[PDB]
């Protein structure tokens, strides 16, 4: 019934900047629900004709676009959302 | 109500319809929106 | 050659590309490339199935035509099957130019060795 | 249900029908007559759940070119400098259909115009402007007859071609304004033939650069050489490249023009370079 | 590149005849074009480099900017037809003092200028087809007073039709050239 | 942190005129627009409701919309009318006729693009935008239809801001319009989806305020609209003056709304007292708290004794200690414990602001979230069902073009809202 | 650096009269000719437009030409008319008959020698001569025919100076004269060869300026001629007063004209605003720039949204910052980037002058070179082709003596001008 209206993304800064600030490259995998202190939220607007399929395609494009990415969120017009995470960290696909 | 260089005079204009309060309003507004503290062509005025 | 529910015609080529053609003027609307010569197109309520000459079966979705692979089989006389010494969860088979390693519990496969134009005859584990 | 073939770039093109309305008929003329507000559910229910991860999806509609918000992604409409234009009616068609012309086509592998009267006695004032007016045609047998007759008249003309120059400017200009590349190529080839066919003709055409050369500027950059890099083109025999033709025509005009053709050509086309000094 | 090759007699790197004439050349073309066309005067295929801006459109050799030709022959010979327009070319050489120097020739230069990195000179072309014989050793000795070792870059700019570029170890007469190098009208 | 106001229809434009009089008085703005105030404290937050014009002048961040200009011409001719920007008046050429479908579908869609253009021009000019504030009646025609249309469009365009509404709702005893149940039901259906927080007022409750508390002999709509302007300007007071414990519209919403459908609130304002009585009682925090919870001082017909408070908020203006505020709110929660929902450990938020309204030593405004609001919706749904079974006056709405399924959906959704309130009223820990 | 003005025909003489009123007011010259100004800056460049007579008096370097003296007697009777030198009024004894060929060939060659004698007497008196300035309409008879004749003669005698024209052109909706297409086509043919810069104004655009922006109830030709006198006096302002970034007619031509035929420009003037609105918005550089680029305020019928800007120029008068000018012109170029021709990296030139027009704190005049001018020439060519194919009124012109081939030449030249504009609009970098 409802249709997607936006998709949210959580990313880490580039690898060189993360090394410059002094945070370890590894030890990012954990069982806790908390996130890294340098992870930033950003959001984007989908077009009117967008559906679940092309929204998921855009999420996959963001996943393969750049390093430093494990969180996703697709927001519907009814206020609900579902999250996408990597089963294995620092490993795409 | 203005001289050639574009400034709003000092004293009341003869047979002016506006009152003193709006005259003071215009003066303070114009002093607020000036870009320099004085006219760079004062010396060329005659009377 | 299989017709979709809407009326358009599906095609399958020897190069491995699958396209969708319009019923009005026969122009390409969507396209996917898969491995192996396509021999067989199926219809499922949520998508399509494509079968290839190299015994690969793909599942594609009619929404925007993305392909995924769920089948791996040999296509010629299987010559030999062996087990490792002391291990039974996996076994290796040889057939034509291919050597494959399967998982005995789940019938999956994660390894492949290919030398094109040749035939493998006997395999053994160290 | 019904099918519609692409029908483009083929023997039956509706594109050639829109231009040159006079074409399409047989050897003779035309035949004698007789031959509300429906409910669509609750689309959004986001009230009471405002958050910072939301942002606007509508963002008004469209954009004005010079408003405060900006033009957005709007673009102005194209003028259509290269759009094909309708072909004006020609006097050659009327004079050929009526039956006043003394030429007929002699078939063969190399087509040649058979002349029923000696060319040197013709009144070029009546005939030469008529033939140049037929270059604009795009239907057989008018194209070959008109252009080959133009070449034949120019080649065998002699000293009588020179006084005809003022009467030839209007057909030359009207042929170039049609924005059909093949008509442009034919006109350019005939112009190259005309320049050298006689003497004191190049000096006569200097005052008329104001009417001819404006169309040269538009098409000097169009090229058919779509081959990548070092690949050769095997259709060079046809001479269907507009840019090379216009460049060599400009150079020939400069060489045969006389003392001060360069300044006029430079005033017409800006990116020109002199070929003499 | 040519450091380990045999270098004697004639060494040619360009030729209009062939499957890939521009194999070891790179093209930087804007507001212009490059193509191979048949020539009217000599009735054979030639390359054409024509553009509205002289500086922007050119072809370089070798393709990788970090590579050097490494050719030790003293002379450079070109086969260029003038089109009554602008034309320029560059050669970069190396001397026994270890300094990379440039030699630029253009047909619209007014005065010769000598600088520690560049020596710009005028160049005039005759009507029709021309062969240009270039003496790198003499020019280097006359400009910088320093011996010549090798060339390591060749450039060509619009506009000009080209058939063959080759190096030679000395000047040769008309009859001493092999048939494939001599042009015929 | 600036708010943009929208005034729609006759009721909205009339209440708005009194609101902008009260706000202009508090910040010392002459009806010519000249600042004439008497403390710098007034100027330093003037931006919250006023935009700054170039010379000596201030302009108010408000959009006026109506379908026939009669009300607008009366307010523009009024004593403060000149302050409003001429370009901000948007009007049509024929009235809404008090019909929701006409106001929503025919002239609504005709004007709405020009209204959205004005709202966007005003919003994009702000350096940081706070929520919108809208005043309209739910029983009318252009108020209900165009107000809810505009609310839906702004929620599409600004989903991250706050949406706040003040709304007039039909009295339980006497109707002002014959077709009120349809317009009210459709508007409440639209609001419960679109709105973040909505306040509801009965004119009958204001009449009881006037007669019992102020004992006015001859009240006029100016008095009712002054009471409303007092509470509306009071809720935002902490936004625009310093204080010991700051508060904000978003923080109010976060503390008041437990679940997103439960966003309908009651309002009250305390230092109401008749000209004869003031000699008998000095101002103090206990007196304000006692008036604050007295149902005589509440602006809705439903009474708290039949429901329970999920949450409440009190905003205090004046120079006072935090100890008395905190202990009064504790004592009221402890003494009346059966009327407070037991699975929330503390239902009242307090806030304190230093600067009272002129001529009062202290003031408080009260906002309350109480389940007794379900009886009002039940009454409206009953009257709707009575009218719909007989298709009462239905041809007007059907002739404009509405599907009946809209009416059955809106009735079903409101009925589910009353059921949801009833379930949470009688919920238990178990 | 002094300019000589020529006013031809009825339109030209009336616009000239209003222009010389505006200029004499700006330099503080009494209509008796006595200097009564209040700053030395007024006196120090008076030579640019005035010649010095012995006593108090100053005389303006202008020639008035017309074929019937009715207009001259009206201008001599006007409020500033006395200032003009009596010997400078040149008139014949029979009218132009609204016919271009008559105006060009029969009375033109009869009168032109006395006009050339006066123009030479005025020109040879200058110590250094700057360009000529000519005002005329293109739709009339003596204005078009004798104006273009005189322009051609002056271009023969002074080819190295500047020739500048202001020209009135037929409205797209209503004609004032039946034979307008012939006179317009022949005049544009003369101008594109002879002129250096030509400005075009539609009376319809001035009516829409007056009605929409100034809200005048009953505008008159005095208002239209004031708008024209404002732009005309603005173009020359940097010649005759100090400033932070001087500019000159030749610098305008060099920056505006990419190729010599593309010299026809549209005009606008910014601080137009009604007495009621003026209280709500102070003058500032963002406001002037926003009004300046709004097509509502531009004086041609073609709209910028159908074309692209090759170049534009803005001349600012007043004491103002350069930073605001530079950043606004950059911001406007960046936000609307598709409407600016891409093979020029920055299309707008700015200039700043210290001395505003009297009674305004600041002003800007805008000159724009836009391809949408092609629509006007195409429309005129269409109406010309409709009339000429049918020989609609040609016998009058042929009876004066014109060959029919002139009409086909003028049509062809205008059609080529349209083609050149269309080609440069759709050009690309490749
Ligand atoms: N409190 C108050 N109520 C009002 C006022 N004006 C109208 N109303 C009420 O609002 C309802 C009429 O709605 P109305 O504003 O006329 O709707 P509209 O026609 O769409 O603008 C009735 O219940 C009136 O009693 C006012 O100034 N104050
Ligand atoms: N803007 C403006 N246009 C004018 C004025 N007087 C006449 N016109 C227009 O000019 C055209 C008439 O041309 P006119 O000057 O009479 O030509 P003439 O007879 O040769 O002098 C018509 O379009 C008139 O509307 C004027 O004072 N101002």
């Amino acid at each position: 019934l409802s249709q997607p209206v936006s998709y949210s993304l959580l990313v880490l800064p580039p690898k060189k900047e993360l090394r410059k600030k002094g945070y370890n490259m590894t030890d990012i995998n954990t069982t806790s629900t908390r996130v890294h202190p340098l992870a930033r939220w950003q959001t984007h607007v989908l077009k009117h004709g967008a559906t679940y399929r092309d929204a998921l395609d855009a999420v996959e494009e963001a996943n393969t676009k750049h390093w430093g990415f494990l969180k996703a969120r697709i927001q519907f017009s009814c206020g609900s959302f579902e999250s996408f995470v990597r089963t294995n960290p620092n490993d795409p696909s | 109500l203005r001289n050639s260089h574009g400034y709003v005079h000092k004293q009341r204009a003869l047979d002016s319809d506006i009152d003193l309060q709006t005259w003071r309003r215009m003066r303070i507004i114009e002093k607020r929106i000036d870009v320099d503290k004085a006219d760079p062509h004062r010396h060329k005025l005659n009377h | 050659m299989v017709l979709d529910p809407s009326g358009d015609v599906l095609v399958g080529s020897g190069s491995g590309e699958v396209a969708l053609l319009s019923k009005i003027n026969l122009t390409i609307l969507k396209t996917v490339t898969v491995q192996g010569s396509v021999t067989g197109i199926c219809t499922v309520p949520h998508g399509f199935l494509v079968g290839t000459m190299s015994s690969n079966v793909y599942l594609v979705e009619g929404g925007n035509f993305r392909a995924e692979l769920r089948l791996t089989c040999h296509s010629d006389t299987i010559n030999d099957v062996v087990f490792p010494e002391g291990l039974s969860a996996l076994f290796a088979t040889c057939c034509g130019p291919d050597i494959r390693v399967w998982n005995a519990a789940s019938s999956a496969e994660l390894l492949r060795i290919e030398i094109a134009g040749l035939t493998c005859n006997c395999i053994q584990f160290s | 249900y019904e099918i519609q073939p692409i029908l483009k770039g083929t023997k039956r093109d509706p594109a050639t029908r829109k231009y040159n309305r006079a074409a399409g008929k047989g050897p003779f003329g035309a035949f004698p007559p007789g031959y509300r507000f429906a409910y669509k559910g609750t689309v959004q229910r986001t009230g009471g759940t405002t958050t910072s991860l939301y942002k606007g999806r509508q963002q008004h509609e469209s954009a004005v070119a010079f408003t405060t918000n900006g033009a957005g992604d709007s673009k102005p409409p194209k003028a259509g400098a290269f759009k094909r234009r309708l072909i004006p009616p020609t006097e050659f068609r009327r004079y050929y259909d009526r039956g006043d012309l003394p030429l007929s086509v002699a078939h063969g592998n190399r087509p040649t115009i058979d002349w029923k009267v000696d060319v040197e006695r013709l009144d070029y004032h009546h005939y030469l402007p008529i033939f140049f007016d037929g270059i604009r045609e795009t239907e057989e047998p008018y194209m070959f007859l008109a252009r080959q007759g133009c070449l034949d008249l120019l080649k065998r003309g002699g000293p009588k071609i020179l006084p005809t120059i003022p009467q030839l400017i209007i057909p030359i200009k009207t042929a170039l304004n049609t924005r059909h590349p093949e008509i442009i190529c034919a006109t350019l080839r005939i112009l190259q033939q005309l320049i050298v066919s006689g003497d004191l003709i190049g000096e006569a055409l200097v005052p008329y650069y104001r009417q001819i050369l404006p169309m040269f500027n538009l098409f000097k950059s169009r090229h058919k050489n779509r081959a990548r890099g070092d690949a050769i083109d095997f259709g060079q025999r046809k001479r269907d490249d507009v840019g090379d033709l216009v460049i060599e025509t400009l150079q020939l005009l400069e060489v045969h023009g006389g003392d001060d053709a360069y300044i006029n050509i430079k005033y017409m086309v800006p990116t020109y370079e002199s070929c003499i000094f | 590149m040519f450091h380990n090759s045999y270098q004697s007699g004639f060494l040619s790197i360009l030729y209009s005849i062939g499957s890939r004439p521009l194999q070891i050349w790179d093209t930087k073309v804007r507001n212009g074009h490059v193509k191979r066309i048949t020539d009217e005067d000599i009735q054979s295929s030639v390359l054409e480099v024509v553009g509205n801006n002289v500086s922007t459109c050119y072809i370089t050799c070798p393709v990788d900017p970090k590579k050097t030709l490494g050719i030790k022959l003293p002379f450079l010979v070109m086969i260029i037809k003038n089109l009554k327009r602008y034309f320029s070319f560059e050669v970069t050489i190396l001397d026994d003092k270890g300094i990379r120097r440039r030699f630029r020739a253009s047909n619209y230069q007014t005065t010769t200028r000598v600088k520690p990195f560049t020596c710009t000179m005028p160049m005039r072309l005759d009507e029709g087809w021309n062969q240009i014989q270039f003496n790198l050793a003499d020019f280097t000795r006359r400009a910088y007073g320093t011996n010549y070792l090798e060339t390591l870059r060749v450039q060509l700019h619009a506009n000009c039709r080209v058939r063959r570029l080759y190096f030679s170890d000395r000047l040769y007469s008309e009859e001493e050239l092999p048939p494939e190098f001599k042009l015929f009208l | 942190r600036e708010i943009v106001c929208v005034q729609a229809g006759q009721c909205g434009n009339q209440i708005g005129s009194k609101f902008w009089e009260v706000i202009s008085d508090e910040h010392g703005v002459d009806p010519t627009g000249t600042y004439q105030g008497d403390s710098d404290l007034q100027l330093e937050r003037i931006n919250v409701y006023f935009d700054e014009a170039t010379g000596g002048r201030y302009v108010p961040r408000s959009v006026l919309i109506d379908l026939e200009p009669g009300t607008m011409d009366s307010v523009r001719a009024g004593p403060y009318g000149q302050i409003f920007r001429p370009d901000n008046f948007i009007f049509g050429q024929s009235g809404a006729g008090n019909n929701w479908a006409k106001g929503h579908y025919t002239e609504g869609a005709e004007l709405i693009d020009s209204v959205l253009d004005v709202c966007c021009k005003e919003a994009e000019s702000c350096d940081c935008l706070q929520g919108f504030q809208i005043c309209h009646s739910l029983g009318g025609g252009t108020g209900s239809g165009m107000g809810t249309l505009l609310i839906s469009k702004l929620r599409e365009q600004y989903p991250d801001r706050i949406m706040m509404t003040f709304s007039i709702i039909p009295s339980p005893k006497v109707s002002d319009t014959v077709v009120e149940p349809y317009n009210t039901t459709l508007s409440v259906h639209q609001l419960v989806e679109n709105s973040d927080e909505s306040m509801c007022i009965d004119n009958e409750a204001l009449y009881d305020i006037c007669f019992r508390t102020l004992k006015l002999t001859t009240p006029t709509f100016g008095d009712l609209n002054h009471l409303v302007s007092a509470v509306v300007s009071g809720v935002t007071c902490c936004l625009r003056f310093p204080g010991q414990l700051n508060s904000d519209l978003r923080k109010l919403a976060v503390n008041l709304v437990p679940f997103p459908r439960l966003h309908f609130f009651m309002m009250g304002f305390a230092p109401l007292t008749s000209r004869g009585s003031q000699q008998y009682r000095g101002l103090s925090v206990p007196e304000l708290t006692q008036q604050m919870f007295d149902a005589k001082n509440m602006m809705q017909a439903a009474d708290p004794r039949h429901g329970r408070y999920l949450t409440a908020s009190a905003l205090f203006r004046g120079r006072m200690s935090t100890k008395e505020v905190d202990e009064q709110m504790l004592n009221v929660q402890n003494k009346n414990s059966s009327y407070f929902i037991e699975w929330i450990p503390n239902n009242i938020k307090s806030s304190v602001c230093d600067i009272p309204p002129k001529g009062l030593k202290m003031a408080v405004t009260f906002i309350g979230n109480n389940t007794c609001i379900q009886e009002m919706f039940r009454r409206v749904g009953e009257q709707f069902t009575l009218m719909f079974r007989r298709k009462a006056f239905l041809h007007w709405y059907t002739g404009e073009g509405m599907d009946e399924m809209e009416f059955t959906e809106a009735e079903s959704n409101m009925n589910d809202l009353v059921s949801e309130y009833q379930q949470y009223q009688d919920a238990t820990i178990e």
Side-chain angles (χ1 to χ4, degrees), chain E residues 115-131:
Chain E
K115 284 299 171 153
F117 292 140
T118 300
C119 178
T120 64
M121 42 190 81
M123 152 204 72
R124 187 181 177 182
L125 264 47
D126 277 286
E127 190 276 331
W129 279 95
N130 298 319
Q131 59 271 16

Side-chain angles (χ1 to χ4, degrees), chain F residues 27 66 117 211 270 303 425:
Chain F
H27 288 180
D66 198 346
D117 285 346
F211 178 65
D303 60 345
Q425 187 190 269

Side-chain angles (χ1 to χ4, degrees), chain F residues 145 216 327:
Chain F
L216 301 181
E327 297 294 333

Side-chain angles (χ1 to χ4, degrees), chain C residues 50-102:
Chain C
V50 175
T52 75
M53 182 155 298
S54 179
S55 312
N56 297 313
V57 164
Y58 294 80
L59 161 66
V60 303
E61 293 179 353
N64 54 351
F65 271 49
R66 283 85 170 93
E68 65 183 1
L69 187 153
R70 53 191 71 201
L71 212 55
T72 61
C73 315
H74 284 292
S75 57
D76 189 358
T77 295
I78 298 172
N79 286 83
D80 172 337
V81 60
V82 289
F83 281 90
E85 182 65 26
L87 277 296
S88 175
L90 73 165
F91 59 100
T93 61
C94 72
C95 180
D98 291 331
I99 302 174
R100 300 187 189 225
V101 169
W102 311 88

Side-chain angles (χ1 to χ4, degrees), chain F residues 224-295:
Chain F
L224 279 80
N225 297 352
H226 194 66
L227 292 173
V228 179
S229 300
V231 65
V232 63
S233 62
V235 70
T236 186
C237 71
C238 169
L239 183 63
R240 71 185 190 277
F241 284 123
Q244 293 179 75
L245 184 59
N246 287 189
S247 68
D248 189 358
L249 305 185
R250 179 164 324 258
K251 186 148 63 73
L252 292 172
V254 173
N255 287 268
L256 285 169
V257 180
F259 303 105
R261 287 172 59 87
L262 271 60
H263 64 244
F264 299 89
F265 307 144
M266 301 179 314
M267 51 175 37
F269 170 87
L272 298 173
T273 182
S274 78
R275 285 186 283 262
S277 55
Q278 180 69 258
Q279 70 189 359
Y280 295 99
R281 64 141 191 77
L283 294 176
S284 179
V285 179
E287 181 63 29
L288 290 184
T289 305
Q290 200 280 343
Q291 202 144 1
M292 183 186 308
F293 283 102
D294 188 357

Side-chain angles (χ1 to χ4, degrees), chain F residues 105-118:
Chain F
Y105 287 121
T106 68
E107 313 95 10
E110 283 295 326
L111 268 194
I112 191 65
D113 292 336
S114 72
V115 178
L116 287 177
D117 285 346
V118 177

